[PDB]
């Protein structure tokens, strides 16, 4: 009598493989969310078809698979629009800015697949990159020392060509007050604390500076940029957000 | 140079007051999310104005306050569209279906305020009501015993008149395989287990039956209905969803 | 054949009432955890007796009730040692240090009841108080600006007399680099940023300074003190901990 | 003046490698918790030594490494007792009980290292295995259909020889009402629903039956067994627990 707008499954772990920019690949584990819009004659028993599709490929699911996975999905469930989601930790081995001392840093990356009007596919990637931010307010009023916090710059990007996930990470890291390292030597901490003090940005200043970089990248069709402070002196969170379609 | 689409704060507790249908009111605590779209000449220092507005009213914030709060918000931050959110636990003292033995049940209720084009206000309420659901699949194939699970029927409703939060709860509870009670006597458990067995519904069947009730309520302009199983025999979650505007 | 060491229920919301130091009381909502050690002839059906006991008192449970609740618990379940737990948000209306501008601050308080060897009761309270902390490392090496973060000073205290929860909060807040306020005016932020810069403490320095205050309070029989940084420049958490019995 | 009882870091992701029983190894990602008891002359700057130790080994940390890691830890921080923790998802490709249809199932495994009195090492592993449980209460009173739920059997084991993590998983899975599969065909669901109905166990019955198996394994020095229901008809959680040292 009434059409179901969407059916799907969520909260389902499964091993995945992701390629490094520095030639190679990471073997990690992703949380999944799959669904299909306006399924026809959907019998409630067919819910386990999602799990089928997810297991029918490899032991470790590649991003390459997103093509057939979505194709199988929409056909096996008689809809013409589908959606997949793959959220996983991703590691970069960063070099301390002065010492060169390497240490791993983790980012929450999520790849999002989409298929509409029968066969029209579209890829989107999202990164939650952790940065340190000093706000220029404290810098101005207080004579010595300015308060800083941990921040999360989230960038989601509707892509039209290939982009390394590392590139989008860098855009955020470059644009922040300062980037996080994980292991800091004595000379390193001297650097980053002064580097951040000499480069203070408000929550809106970061999102603005990122948006501006993303406006000009021709591989990006649409984007959402959000940064949020986990306030060092307030116990709440402030956020700013920009979103544009091209 | 580039317009900020939105700025706001989130993750901020504050005591609240909510009226019972059975004359009275609950004194509880809500998590908040406030923001404003397209603020003009927004100085990063003005972020603490949200906290001001939140504290400038009562010790316990009432739903009544949503009017001035949003009005203050959009003016104090020079935007013409704002948004508030108030998520809290809500309690009903339910009577065991056979025994009449009373016990409390908690629901995650969230009130959402909106103000657009200068002064046009709009209210939305959302409830995550816990139900038990037996799926008619097991009922059919297995000779004895059918597997059931805990489910979450989420109903969000763009309202155009007053609705008791209890009413929307009931719509969900009536439409489920069976409702949750919290305290069951021997005769009660005999009832509810058989009641659910004789009333099995798939995840799509529940959302369909709820949507149908909501289509005809003239106090409801738009709605989202979602139910999801925390699968007893699968370790993942299946969900179905319906959404309509009138 | 084999004795069950403990049975209990957890994850159960219920409205509660807590008295303010500044005469009055807060009406909020607590998460519960109840259990009993070495129950005799425990039939699995008796699990719903916990819910009974929890509902058999008031609509809003008081700390006073902990006496009979535990007494009922151990008797109704034939054990001689029981345990209750009551975790809730708690609010203090703080005055900005220079302006006097009042704003609410929330703390995660948890009251813990214990009854052993038949009838020997014992009370314990725990507070997770949010503070800002500057570590004297950055202060030393970098010429200008020192990095700070949000910290959680957790104090749990086996009490032998009455203590206001506010007092234990203060002990933590006084001993921190600086305390959190929620709403800061221009003169206020000037103060707190300099106040913290002139009072830097490592994670171990805070726990040490708190422990020392608690050693001499004769109302405290045993304590656990823990502080942890949500590292502004590292993406992990460091913690220090002290624990003593008297 | 006052001795710090422990210092450490927590909440830190890092890639790991774990061997399969069916010859091989899983490449996944673990959350870490490291600490050292009673460190001498601990300077607050030395906190980043934990991160050093964690990065100084491989890109993917093996369980083998736990020896030197703990040895480095206690020496580099001048204490004689240390502790490491490694929590990660672990996958088994299970065969549907009737069909043989393979699908992955994830378990939350955590390896725990300990080093005391200078050099005395000790290994502990913990598994949170998801099972379905029917309680014999509903089976008895209601004429048709008995209510079941998802359950978590947690087994932590102080080991004195090598044990496959898969073995401990099986102990739990065998002892449950029925085990979870992830993908069920029509004949499979017919089986498992009847299999669980003909094998009902209370929360205490499961922990008792597991404890009994673990009492007789000579590779196990001490254990904690806990199962908890996510109540299908109650909205809270019941749990039972057993713990013994040998």
């Amino acid at each position: 009598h009434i059409a179901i707008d969407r059916v799907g499954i969520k909260a389902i772990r499964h091993p995945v493989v992701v390629a490094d920019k520095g030639g190679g690949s990471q073997h990690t584990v992703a949380q999944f969310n799959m669904y299909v819009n306006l399924p026809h004659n959907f019998k409630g028993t067919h819910m386990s078809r999602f799990v089928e599709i997810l297991n029918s490929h490899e032991r470790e699911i590649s991003v390459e698979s997103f093509e057939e996975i979505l194709r199988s999905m929409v056909s096996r469930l008689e809809s013409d629009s589908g959606h997949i989601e793959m959220a996983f930790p991703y590691f970069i081995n960063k070099s301390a800015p002065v010492s060169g001392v390497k240490s791993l840093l983790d980012y929450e990356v999520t790849f999002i697949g989409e298929i509409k009007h029968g066969n029209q596919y579209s890829f989107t990637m999202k990164v939650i990159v952790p940065v340190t931010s000093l706000c220029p307010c404290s810098k101005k009023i207080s004579d010595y020392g300015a308060h800083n916090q941990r921040s999360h710059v989230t960038i989601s990007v509707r892509t039209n060509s290939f982009i390394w996930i590392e590139d989008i990470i860098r855009i955020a890291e470059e644009q922040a007050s300062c980037e996080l390292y994980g292991l800091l030597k004595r000379p390193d901490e001297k650097y980053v604390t002064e580097r951040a003090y000499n480069n203070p940005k408000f929550v809106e200043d970061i999102v603005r500076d990122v948006a501006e970089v993303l406006n000009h990248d021709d591989r990006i069709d649409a984007y959402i940029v959000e940064s949020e402070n986990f306030e060092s002196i307030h116990n709440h969170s402030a956020y700013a957000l920009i979103e544009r379609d091209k």
Side-chain angles (χ1 to χ4, degrees), chain A:
Chain A
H1 34 259
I2 322 152
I4 261 75
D5 291 8
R6 63 156 137 268
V7 284
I9 96 286
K10 56 185 199 174
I12 171 160
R13 298 209 211 101
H14 196 288
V16 289
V17 64
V18 189
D20 289 354
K21 190 186 202 178
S25 62
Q26 282 178 49
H27 307 280
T28 181
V29 52
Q31 203 88 26
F32 281 85
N33 194 133
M34 297 155 76
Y35 70 78
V36 284
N37 300 320
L38 297 88
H40 294 84
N41 102 298
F42 179 75
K43 283 90 164 282
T45 55
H46 299 146
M47 267 296 189
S48 50
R49 293 188 186 207
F50 286 111
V51 196
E52 281 181 338
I53 301 162
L54 203 62
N55 282 272
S56 59
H57 284 74
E58 294 308 326
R59 166 62 179 248
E60 292 184 313
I61 295 169
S62 183
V63 201
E64 319 279 12
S65 313
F66 271 40
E67 203 70 30
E68 316 97 72
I69 301 178
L70 281 163
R71 205 158 315 274
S72 307
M73 236 177 291
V74 291
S75 80
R76 288 280 283 155
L77 288 143
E78 290 178 52
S79 66
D80 58 358
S81 55
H83 183 109
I84 189 166
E85 213 140 332
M86 172 177 146
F88 54 87
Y90 189 80
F91 293 91
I92 299 178
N93 204 194
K94 314 259 263 69
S95 300
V98 172
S99 305
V101 172
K102 267 86 78 70
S103 69
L104 278 72
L105 189 65
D106 57 312
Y107 311 86
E108 262 301 314
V109 180
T110 144
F111 295 156
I112 298 164
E114 290 268 23
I115 190 157
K116 293 187 73 187
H117 307 107
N119 65 338
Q120 295 189 54
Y121 172 70
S122 70
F123 186 70
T124 302
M125 73 191 95
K126 168 181 159 169
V127 200
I128 317 165
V129 19
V131 295
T132 170
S133 66
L134 198 104
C135 63
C137 184
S138 281
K139 163 81 179 287
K140 188 172 67 63
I141 51 151
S142 53
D143 304 37
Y144 39 86
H147 103 277
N148 57 309
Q149 49 267 322
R150 198 204 267 110
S151 288
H152 277 29
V153 176
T154 315
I155 303 169
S156 22
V157 149
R158 279 202 48 246
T159 205
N160 68 61
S161 302
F162 178 92
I163 311 178
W164 285 113
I165 200 65
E166 288 95 330
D167 289 352
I168 290 163
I169 287 162
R170 290 329 312 273
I171 294 170
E173 290 195 303
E174 285 170 334
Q175 228 60 232
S177 289
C178 197
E179 47 175 298
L180 259 55
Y181 281 95
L183 188 49
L184 260 25
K185 224 105 276 288
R186 184 165 296 212
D188 294 323
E189 191 160 31
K190 198 268 185 76
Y191 172 77
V192 298
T193 315
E194 290 176 340
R195 156 84 206 281
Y197 188 91
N198 299 320
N199 196 41
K201 290 185 187 185
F202 273 124
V203 202
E204 335 88 51
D205 296 329
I206 308 163
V207 300
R208 199 138 45 184
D209 297 355
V210 173
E212 206 277 307
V213 177
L214 300 178
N215 281 135
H216 302 312
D217 198 308
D218 73 351
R219 296 168 305 178
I220 295 162
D221 283 342
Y223 65 93
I224 298 94
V225 185
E226 191 196 303
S227 72
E228 68 160 305
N229 290 184
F230 306 106
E231 303 276 63
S232 274
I233 49 170
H234 282 305
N235 197 42
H236 57 84
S237 274
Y239 69 93
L241 185 144
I242 287 164
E243 173 195 292
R244 203 207 163 188
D245 200 330
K246 298 146 77 175

